[PDB]
Amino acid sequence: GSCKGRCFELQPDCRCDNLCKSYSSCCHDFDELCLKTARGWECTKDRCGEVRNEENACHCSEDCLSRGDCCTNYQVVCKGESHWVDDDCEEIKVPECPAGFVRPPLIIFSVDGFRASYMKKGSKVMPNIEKLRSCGTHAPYMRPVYPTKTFPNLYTLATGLYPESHGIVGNSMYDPVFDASFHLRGREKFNHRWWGGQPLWITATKQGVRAGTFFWSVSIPHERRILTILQWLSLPDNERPSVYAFYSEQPDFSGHKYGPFGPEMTNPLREIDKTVGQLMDGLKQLRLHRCVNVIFVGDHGMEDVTCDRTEFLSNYLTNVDDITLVPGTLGRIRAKSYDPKTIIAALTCKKPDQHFKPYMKQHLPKRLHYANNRRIEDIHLLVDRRWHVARKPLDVYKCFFQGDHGFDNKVNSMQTVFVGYGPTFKYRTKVPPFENIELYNVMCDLLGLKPAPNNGTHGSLNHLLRTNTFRPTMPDEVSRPNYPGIMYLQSEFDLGCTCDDGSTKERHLLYGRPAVLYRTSYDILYHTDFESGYSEIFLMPLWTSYTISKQAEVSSIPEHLTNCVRPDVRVSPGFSQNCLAYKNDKQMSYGFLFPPYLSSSPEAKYDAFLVTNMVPMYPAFKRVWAYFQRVLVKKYASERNGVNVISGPIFDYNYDGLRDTEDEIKQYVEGSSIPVPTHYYSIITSCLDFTQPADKCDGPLSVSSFILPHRPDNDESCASSEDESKWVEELMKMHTARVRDIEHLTGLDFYRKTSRSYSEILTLKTYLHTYE
Ligand SMILES: *[C@@H]1O[C@H](CO)[C@@H](O[C@@H]2O[C@H](CO)[C@@H](O[C@@H]3O[C@H](CO)[C@@H](O)[C@H](O)[C@@H]3O)[C@H](O)[C@H]2NC(C)=O)[C@H](O)[C@H]1NC(C)=O
Ligand SMILES: O=C(OCc1cc(Cl)cc(Cl)c1)N1CCN(CC[C@@H](O)c2ccc3[nH]c(=O)oc3c2)CC1
Ligand SMILES: CC(C)CCC[C@@H](C)[C@H]1CC[C@H]2[C@@H]3[C@H](O)C=C4C[C@@H](O)CC[C@]4(C)[C@H]3CC[C@]12C
Ligand SMILES: [Ca+2]
Ligand code: NA
Ligand code: NA
Ligand SMILES: [Zn+2]
Ligand SMILES: [Zn+2]
């Protein structure tokens, strides 16, 4: 019944752990013994050498070091030591830990709503943080997951999983299997049923590594959280955790009230830095300041949003009482106790300035990875940055907030911070921006743990670390290609088609053949202008590769070839598409993967009309694809000193972000076994050093990629009635993708033969071109 000698113990009989408040199960004496605040949190000169008083918050007695409960500034005030922040960076070449430490501890210092750009304020406001950032390893920014809300991001940090995989797809969710709702406020969130994957503290415990608590009752002051962490670190080897987390509700709280750019934001940032100072001072006191790896990380940024920039569903829908809306910086809509198609139509391009866009979740940009969970409603609203969506005018209250977050994770204002400091991180090193899904693997590496399966690309962040305990290995090809020669005659083909008619590898396949990582049968097909990997199962290329020089010439499809499709004599009639299917399918047309517009000669252009280069395309989609092919590829080649393009189909009918089996394809061209892609990708590569052409590049590569939804209309693009130069590129930028996203969706593995290290290539594959 007592907390005596058990305050913040690590293990209905009453509790003294840091969460007992939140379960209201603290012992009677918990507040009096575990939450002392007398004399506050700093030693002063007159307190030095005091007789211990057990009522003090922390201690300045001679014995306090033997007890591990000195105030964090005790050595500075009472033994003439300097503050950690006043010492120069000294490179930490190896961990300097007490004997009997078996690995360097990790302290995750997470800051709620810490926008990346707040680092620009410097050592005047945040001297401790600025030193961590200077002396350690930092990124200019770290990309959060969608939605850019607290719980989905913190749990992503902890698990390496997209929200659709870990299950915390929002701060609020409804689970139809449970018939219950999860919210920030309430007891429901404490139920383990909501939480999937395997968070870091569990991964650690399962592998015999002790974790401190990762959650702090809001009642526990920040200074006490630091002292508790420091006290735990002074535990004997058999009890001491190896991983700890601190969380700060700032600067989020202030960011919401004043917005991200308020002068009132300086004080919260000063307070966070002061807390960082206390930890680093505390660590220095314990001589652990060259032992512990410290991660300073946020969950997401903060945007200017005021209640005056709110769209109301009641101005679109004829009855908003039939719907339940999860509102704000995103929208999720389901039936109250109603028809989806009607709802989407009523929300689509109805006002010129319309500040959100409806999507069926499967049509959301694939880069969001926000579909494959029963908690994500079919109907989704992407809200423009700076705006909210709500059900009706009465739902806005007057404004109480000037900042918010939750928007699309490529939005600048949503980006957050990463700093790594300690023996295992590099010294004075800047690394490119990366996604928070990657951190779990790193944290596992830092702790000697095997990560549970997750969505990071293990190895992609090796360049953050002085020492790597993980070397990635390139996956093995599963299917070997065939290289068919000419073995069928024109007259053997009955495809209903009609037409009025080996340095390929050096030129067109710059980074090696893509490896097929699933069992299938496919053919390598060579031509003057392009190479392709043609699937006998799907009757089309898995990929088509070609290189367009800066100086390449765009030509038209001549009239006499407008409807030309030619049989490919290297491939059987039985493993080819047929033109009758397209003639019969009233809604479906076709396009070409290698564009006829970029043929090297009139003679070569005939290759582009081979049936093995043809893919099913809605006429609506052809507007987008034809523009990309006719105008944008030349534009990119001209800007980037040539480009290599790999394009192809994706099939993801079950919207899990993973390539479909034949079994999962739900749509075929009428009367045929020609599957309809859900998306078309392209990967566009050139030299990072643009003074070198794409085909003669000695160094780092530069990539941008997209996964375009293969839609029968352009309802997504409200300006699609206009010329393609007004909207298609905007469409493409929205559906920007990582190469890795394409790899998951195709079963292909790119960049197998380059002059770059595999870890560098993994970094390249995880890059997202954001266009901000
Ligand atoms: C993000 O990472 C997660 C975790 O690795 C991936 O989810 C995992 O996906 C696999 C493959 O679908 C699931 O394994 C499979 O489970 C089924 C059904 O139980 C079984 O029939 C198969 O034999 C196979 O083992 C696995 O459950 C699942 N893990 C989760 C949800 O935690 C996910 O695919 C990744 N997402 C992307 C877009 O790459
Ligand atoms: O200490 C914690 O975890 C630290 C941690 C670190 C790491 Cl790396 C991983 C993990 Cl898994 C957890 N806690 C997490 C939740 N937090 C209150 C949330 C709630 O008060 C809140 C906060 C901000 C909001 N913004 C908003 O719009 O609504 C909000 C609601 C306090 C307890
Ligand atoms: C003040 C409030 C915001 C605090 C709320 C914290 C709450 C969400 C935490 C408390 C306990 C946590 C669970 C616990 O660590 C065990 C597991 C096992 C793991 O495999 C899945 C996660 C889960 C259920 C934790 C989820 C987060 C919980 C409920
Ligand atoms: Ca799939
Ligand atoms: Na047709
Ligand atoms: Na349109
Ligand atoms: Zn947050
Ligand atoms: Zn917030």
Residue type, 212: G
d(CA 432, CA 647): 26
Gap sites in the chain (C to N > 2.5 Å), preceding residue numbers: 11, 337, 398, 501
Ligand 3 pocket mutation, candidates 192, 210, 225, criterion most atoms within 8 A of CB: 192
Within 6 A (CB) of ligand 2 lie 108, 110, 112, 150, 154-155, 157-158, 171, 184, 214-216, 245, 247, 249, 252
* Residue 158, burial from CB neighbour count under 10 angstroms (0-12, 13-18, 19+): buried
| The two structure tokens encoding residue 207 | 């592998």
Distance CA 640, CA 162 (A): 33
Cβ atoms 520, 602 nearer than 8 A: no
Which of 7, 69, 15 minimizes the C-alpha distance to 43? Answer: 69
- Whether the CB-CB separation of 595 and 555 falls below 8 Å is answered with no
Report the distance separating Cα 193 and Cα 178, nearest Å: 9
Q: Tell me whether residue 60 is exposed, middle or buried, using C-beta atoms within 10 angstroms of its C-beta: 0 to 12, 13 to 18, 19 or more.
A: buried
Structure tokens, 507: 């030129």
Give the contacts of 358 (CB within 8 A, at least 6 positions apart): 331, 343, 344, 347, 348, 379, 380, 381
Cβ pair 345, 317 in contact under 8 A: no
The number of angstroms, rounded, from the C-alpha of 496 to the middle of its chain's C-alpha atoms is 46
Task: Count other Cβ atoms within 10 Å, centred on residue 346.
Answer: 14
**Cβ(548)–Cβ(685) below 8 Å:** no
**Cross-strand bridge partners of residue 590:** 616
- If you ran DSSP here, which 8-state letter would residue 615 be given? E
**Which ligand sits nearest to residue 436's alpha carbon?**
2
Sequence-distant (6+) residues with CB within 8 A of 554 are: 597, 598, 630, 631, 634
Q: Is the dihedral angle over the CA atoms 542, 548, 554, 558 positive or is it negative? A: negative
List the structure tokens of 324.
């339940």
CA dist list (Å): 634 to 3, 235, 508, 680, 730: 72, 64, 15, 19, 17
CB of 196 closer than 6 A to ligand 3? no
Are 550 and 637 in contact, with CB atoms under 8 Å apart?
A: yes
Q: Which residues surround ligand 6, an ion (CB under 5 A)?
A: 714, 717, 720
Give the sign of the dihedral formed by CA 520, CA 541, CA 579, CA 655: positive
DSSP assignment, residue 56?
B
Beta strands in 581-715 (DSSP E): 589-592, 614-617, 643-650, 679-687, 701-709
Q: Which CATH superfamily is domain 490-766 in?
A: Extracellular Endonuclease, subunit A (3.40.570.10)
**What are the Cα distances from residue 48, in Å, to 65, 79, 284, 706?**
13, 9, 18, 63
Q: Which residues keep their CB under 5 angstroms from ion ligand 5? A: 582, 585, 588
Q: What strands lie across the sheet with 330-335, from one edge to the other?
A: 323-326, 330-335, 379-383, 356-360
Kindly state the tokens that stand for 17: 């752990």
User: Within 10 A of 450 (CB to CB), how many other CB atoms are there?
Assistant: 10
Query: Rounded to the nearest 10 degrees, what angle do helices 439-447 and 150-159 cross at?
Result: 40
Tokens of 586: 């009233």
Measured by CA distance, the residue closest to atom 27 of ligand 3 is 190
Looking from the CA of 533 toward its CB, the CA atoms found within 13 Å total 25
Q: Is 167 left (phi over 0), alpha (psi -120 to 50) or beta?
A: left
Helix segments in 448-530, DSSP class H: 504-508
The answer to whether residues 204 and 444 touch, using CB atoms and an 8 Å cutoff, is no
Q: Which of 736, 766, 735 is nearest to 750 (CA)?
A: 766
Q: Give the CB-side neighbour count of residue 189, counting CA atoms within 13 A.
A: 16
**Residue count (the chain):** 772
Classify residue 696 by its DSSP letter.
G
To the question of whether residue 150 is assigned a binding role by annotation, the answer is yes
- Ligand 8: centre distance to CA 253 (Å): 6
In the numeric block, the tokens 């582009």 are attached to 608
By DSSP bridging, strand 137-143 and strand 434-435 are: parallel
Three-state DSSP at 72 gives coil
Identify the residue whose C-alpha is closest to ligand 3 atom 14: 192
Residue 46: which residues within 8 A CB-CB, separation 6 or more?
A: none
By alpha-carbon position, which residue is closest to atom 6 of ligand 3?
215
Least Cα distance to 94 among 262, 345, 293 occurs for 293
Work out which ligand 1 atom sits closest to the CA atom of 744.
39
Q: What sign does the CA torsion over 95, 99, 100, 105 have?
A: negative
Residue 9 C-beta-side C-alpha neighbours within 13 Å: 14
267-273-279-282 Cα dihedral, nearest 10 degrees: -90
Q: How many Å apart are CA 161 and CA 435, to the nearest integer?
A: 11
| Cα separation, 627 vs 618, whole angstroms | 14
Three-class secondary structure of residue 748 per DSSP: strand
Written as one letter, the residue type at 243 is V
Tokens at 503, concatenated: 């340095």
Ligand-binding site membership of 405 (annotated): yes
For 384-387, the CB contacts below 8 A with 24+ separation are: 384/355, 384/356, 385/303, 385/411, 385/413, 386/303, 386/304, 386/305, 386/309, 387/305, 387/309, 387/310, 387/311, 387/329, 387/355, 387/356
- At residue 623, what are phi and psi to the nearest 5 degrees? -60, -40
As given in the structure block, the two tokens for residue 564 are 């030309």
Nearest C-alpha neighbor of 221 from the set 190, 187, 241, 249: 249
Cα dist from 596 to 674, 707, 710, whole Å = 22, 21, 20
DSSP structure class, residue 544: E
The answer to whether 275 and 226 are in contact (CB under 8 A) is yes
CA distance 142 to 405: 15
Q: Which amino acid is at 463?
A: H
228: enclosing H helix or E strand: helix 222-233
Crossing angle of the two packed helices 739-746 and 758-766, in degrees rounded to 10: 90
Residues 601, 608: Cα–Cα separation, whole Å: 11
656 is in an annotated binding site: yes
Which residues have a catalytic role annotated? 150
Sorted by sequence, the CB contacts under 8 Å of residue 540 that are 6+ apart come out as 534, 577, 593, 612, 614, 615, 616, 649, 674
Positive/negative CA dihedral, 402, 405, 407, 412: positive
Contact 296, 330 (CB under 8 A): no
3-state secondary structure of 590: strand
DSSP for residue 427: S
Give, in order, the Cα–Cα distances in Å from 7 to each of 36, 229, 284, 333, 623: 11, 12, 24, 45, 67
Is residue 744 within 8 A of residue 456, CB to CB? The reply is no
Q: Cis peptide leading into 251, omega within 30 of 0? A: yes
- Amino acid making up residue 201: W
Q: Which atom of ligand 1 is nearest to the CA of 658?
A: 38
Cα end-to-end span (Å), the chain? 57
Q: Whose CA is nearest to atom 3 of ligand 2?
A: 215
- Please state at what angle helix 127-135 crosses helix 266-285, rounded to 10 degrees: 60
Structure tokens at 80: 């003439």
29 is in an annotated binding site: no
Tokens 């702790």 found at:
447
Task: State in Å: Cα 329 to ligand 2 middle.
Answer: 18
Token digits of residue 378: 């079919």
Integer Cα distance of 652 and 219 in angstroms? 46
- Residue 360 in 3-state DSSP? strand
Handedness of CA 269, 275, 276, 278 (dihedral sign): positive
Residue with tokens 């694809």: 625
Tell whether the torsion through CA atoms of 632, 638, 639 and 641 is positive or negative: positive
Residue-wise DSSP of 174-230: EETTTTEEE-SSSSGGGSGGG--S--HHHHHHHTT--B--S---TTS-HHHHHHHHH
Rounded Cα–Cα distance for residues 432 and 700 (Å): 13
- Is 560 marked as binding a ligand? no
689 labeled binding residue: no
Question: How many Å separate Cα 373 from the centre of its chain?
Answer: 17
Fill in the amino acid letter for 342. T
In contact, 336 and 325? CB cutoff 8 Å: no
Q: Where are the alpha helices (DSSP H) in 521-578?
A: none
Among candidate residues 105, 77, 71, 65, the one with its CA nearest the CA of residue 286? 65
CA angle 412, 413, 414 (to 5 degrees): 90
Q: How far is CA 673 from CA 122, 285, 563, 655, in A?
A: 62, 71, 22, 21
Please tell me whether residue 552 adopts helix, strand or coil conformation.
coil
Ligand 3, atom nearest to 151 Cα: 8
- The rounded distance, in Å, linking the Cα atoms of 222 and 112 is 13
Cβ neighbours of residue 636 under 8 Å, at least 6 residues apart? 548, 643, 684, 686, 704
- The bridge status of strand 388-390 relative to strand 310-312 is parallel
Rounded CA gap, 61 and 40, in Å?
Answer: 15
CA distance 107 to 310: 40
Identify the three-state secondary structure at position 109.
Answer: strand
Distance CA 444, CA 207 (A): 11
Strands (E), 603-657: 614-617, 643-650
Q: How far apart are CA 744 and CA 758, in angstroms?
A: 18
The one-letter amino acid code at 683 reads: I
- Ligand 3 lined by 189 (C-beta under 6 Å): yes
Structure tokens that stand for 266 in this block: 């300086």
Which helix (H) or strand (E) covers residue 527, if one does?
Answer: none
Residues 742 and 705 sit within 8 Å (Cβ to Cβ) = yes
Return the C-alpha torsion angle 636, 638, 639, 642, nearest 10: 70
Q: Which residues of 564-578 are buried (b: 16+ CB within 10 A; e: fewer)?
A: bbbbbbbbbeebbbb
Helix runs in 287-423, H state only: 340-346
Would the CB of 249 count as within 6 Å of ligand 3? no
CB of 514 closer than 8 Å to CB of 752: yes
Judged on CB neighbours under 10 Å (0-12, 13-18, 19+), 289 is buried
Q: Which tokens is 320 given?
A: 């908003």
Q: What is the resolution of this structure in A?
A: 2.0
CA 292 to chain CA mean position, Å: 27
What is the C-alpha to C-alpha distance for residues 490 and 487, in angstroms, rounded to an integer? 10
d(CA 637, CA 647): 15
Give the SS3 label for residue 736: strand
Contact 295, 106 (CB under 8 A): yes
Beta-strand runs (E) in 113-175: 137-143, 173-175
- Measured in whole angstroms, the distance separating CA 480 from the mean position of its chain's CA atoms is 32
Cα angle: 281, vertex 284, 286; to 5 degrees: 115
Q: Compute, in angstroms, the gap from residue 500 CA to the centroid of ligand 5.
A: 20
Collect all residues with Cβ–Cβ distance below 8 Å to 381 and sequence separation of at least 6.
330, 331, 332, 333, 347, 356, 357, 358, 359, 389
Is it true that the peptide bond before 472 is cis, omega within 30 degrees of 0? no
Euclidean distance between CA atoms 459 and 441, whole angstroms? 8
State how far the alpha carbon of 121 is from the alpha carbons of 63, 118, 140, 216, 345, in Å: 40, 6, 13, 28, 46
Q: What share of residues in the chain are helix, strand, coil (percent, to 5)?
A: 30, 20, 50
Contacts of 122 (CB under 8 A, 6+ apart): 130
CB atoms within 10 A of CB 603: 9
Beta bridge partners of 144: none
| Elucidation method | X-ray
* 8 A C-beta contact, residue 644 and residue 651: no
